[PDB]
């Protein structure tokens, strides 16, 4: 689905390095549609294709306003590319970095509300997501948070999968390699803190092995400078060792709701 001509591409800037190529922001003008502004993914064996082309079969499968949207692809045609929506402020933690302290609480809220509504989706369509991060979740010009970075790889035990990302997996996902739903909900909480850090990187005095180790020994992240009570607390529960006693997104979109109904329970800090 989605396979469009590439006459109707017009390539702009170079904006980002992809992990397989580069990023561009371009023009998008097919017959008897308006122009739109088009963020494109370019591309190795005919497996690393397919891999790669695996991401536009899946995002092309999904609809929903905190899920990124898929344009088309160019296959008929080399350089294969991915063309999605723009998303104008880009990656989340770099957007916060240069942001840092100058977003309120509710706002931050209101971005993780996005991340979890398009995580409640994934978990509904029993997606579940591997690599949640903030890195993963692109930003518009009214800071409409957009889950990204799909596929049907898998991580490496060759492949564009890419290797497990200790500092965002749950201790059980990185022990037996069982990835669910619970295990996103644990990377949620990284997410979490990073968004109330200002994108800060998760366990930035430890290498990934001191992570694993932390963890198995019941350290969890600290609350971030001025973070409200209420939310470290939310994170601690996606954090839990037993999975089955994480909230489920449902329950995480419902918890943030009612702290942004009731902002005055955001005002305690520890
Ligand atoms: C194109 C694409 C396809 C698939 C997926 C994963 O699902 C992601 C994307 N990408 C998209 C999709 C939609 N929007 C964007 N916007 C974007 C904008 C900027 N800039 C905006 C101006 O300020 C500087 C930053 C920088 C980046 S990047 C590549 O450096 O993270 C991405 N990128 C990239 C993340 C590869
Ligand atoms: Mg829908
Ligand atoms: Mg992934
Ligand atoms: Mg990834």
Same mark, same amino acid.
């Given at each position: 689905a989605k396979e469009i001509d590439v006459s109707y591409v017009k390539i702009e800037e170079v904006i980002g390095a992809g992990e397989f190529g580069e990023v561009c922001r371009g023009r998008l003008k097919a017959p008897g549609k308006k122009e739109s502004c088009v963020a494109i993914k370019t591309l190795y064996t005919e497996r690393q294709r397919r891999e790669f082309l695996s991401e536009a079969s899946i995002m092309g499968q999904f609809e929903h306003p905190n899920i990124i949207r898929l344009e088309g692809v160019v296959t008929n045609s080399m350089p294969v590319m991915i063309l999605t929506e723009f %998303? /104008?402020?880009?990656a989340l933690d770099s957007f916060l970095r240069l942001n840092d302290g100058q977003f309120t609480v509710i706002q931050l809220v209101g971005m993780l509300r996005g991340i979890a509504s398009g995580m409640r989706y994934l978990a509904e369509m029993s997606y579940?997501?591997? #690599?949640?991060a903030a890195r993963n979740i692109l930003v518009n010009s009214n800071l409409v948070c957009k889950v990204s970075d799909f596929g049907l790889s898998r991580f490496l /035990?060759?492949?564009?999968?890419?290797?497990?990302?200790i500092r965002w997996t749950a201790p059980e996902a990185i022990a037996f390699r069982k990835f669910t739903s619970a295990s996103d909900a644990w990377s949620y909480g990284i997410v979490m803190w990073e968004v109330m850090s200002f994108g800060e990187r998760p366990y930035? #005095? %430890?290498?990934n092995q001191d992570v694993i180790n932390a963890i198995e020994q019941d350290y969890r992240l600290p609350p971030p400078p001025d973070c409200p009570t209420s939310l470290h607390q939310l994170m601690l529960d996606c954090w839990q060792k037993d999975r089955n006693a994480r909230p489920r997104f449902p329950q995480v979109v419902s918890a943030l709701d009612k702290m942004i109904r009731n902002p005055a329970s955001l005002k305690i800090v520890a």
């Open positions: %998303m /104008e402020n880009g579940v997501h591997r #690599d949640l /035990e060759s492949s564009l999968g890419g290797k497990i990302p930035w #005095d %430890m290498s």
